[PDB]
Amino acid sequence: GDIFYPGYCPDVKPVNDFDLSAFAGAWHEIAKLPLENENQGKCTIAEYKYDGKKASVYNSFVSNGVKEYMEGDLEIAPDAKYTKQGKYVMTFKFGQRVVNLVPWVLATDYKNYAINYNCDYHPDKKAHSIHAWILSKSKVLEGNTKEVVDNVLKTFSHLIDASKFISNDFSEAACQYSTTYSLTGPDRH
């Protein structure tokens, strides 16, 4: 199950001076906090492409030999347009269902790692769930960068319980797929 904690989401401020073009690229999910929709995928990678005017997203993972993917639009969050903070929206369409995902970027050096997060409040439960992802431009978080990440993460110890991260897998095996499948699309729901 996803991780929930009592009460409203805590105050949090994402990264300043966010640079979307610098952020663009293929991000590997080295690890994440449990997230129902993606708990079973492996070799999880999110690829963001930028035009200067337009941004798009290509997300994929592999489940039992199948490569599932999603294609959508990406844009800076309306409020972040004014503050210049790292907050973006990913819009995906499943038939008539439209989804607007909003990851918050707590920190990143743009070339090697990113620490993303979200807080989802359930009023009916008076509790919130927390989601987080350790992202890297390499399939492995390597030694220098590993230390960098760990120290940064530490400054967010009151927002993310590091001990709850779950490592993803990028072995050739894990990433292997015999076939594909688009989760997004007009003939979806």
Ligand X SMILES: C=Cc1c(/C=c2\[nH]/c(=C\C3=NC(=O)C(CCC(=O)O)=C3C)c(C=C)c2C)[nH]c(/C=C2\NC(=O)C(CCC(=O)O)=C2C)c1C
- Residues making contact with ligand X (CB under 6 A): 29, 35, 37-38, 41, 44-46, 59-61, 68-70, 94, 99, 101-103, 116, 118, 120, 131, 133, 183
| Binding map of a second copy across residues 159-188, x = CB under 8 A, - = no contact | --x---------------------------
Closest by CA to 77, choosing from 67, 65, 87, is 87
DSSP for 3-21 reads -EEESSPPP----SS--HH
Q: Please state the closest distance from residue 30 (CB atom) to a second copy, in A.
A: 23
Q: Among all chains, which residue has been given the structure tokens 């492996």?
A: 42
- In the list 11, 51, 79, 187, the residue contacting a second copy (rule: CB under 8 A) is 11
Total residues contacting a second copy by CB under 8 A comes to 10
Element (H, E) at 180: strand 179-182
Q: Among all chains, which residue has been given the structure tokens 């400054």?
A: 155
Element (H, E) at 153: helix 144-154
Q: Please state the closest distance from residue 119 (CB atom) to a second copy, in A.
A: 11
Kindly state whether residue 8 participates in binding a second copy, applying the rule CB under 8 A. Answer: yes
